[PDB]
Design a protein around this nucleic acid. Structure first.
Length: 64
DNA sequence: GTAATTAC
DNA sequence: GTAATTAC
């Protein structure tokens, strides 16, 4: 599952297996991902997020 | 400006 | 401390 989005003017594609953290800001889904060493950031409208990313968010909200 | 949270 | 994300 690839999440596609634009950040700082660059179109990006990141596989959900590289996503490190996911959270909700307002009605947007924001996240960090591994980029071979550095950590990237991205965010999409909840309506453009693939179910797999939303599932990752829901699981995060339940974690102890 | 704030929201959540980060890289920078 | 700020810029970035979608949305208000």
């Amino acid at each position: 599952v690839k999440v596609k989005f634009k950040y700082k003017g660059e179109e990006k594609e990141v596989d959900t297996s590289k996503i490190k953290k996911v959270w909700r800001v307002g009605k947007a889904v924001s996240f960090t991902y591994d980029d071979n060493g550095k950590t990237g950031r991205g965010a999409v409208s909840e309506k453009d997020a693939p179910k797999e990313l939303l599932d990752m968010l829901a699981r995060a909200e339940r974690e102890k």
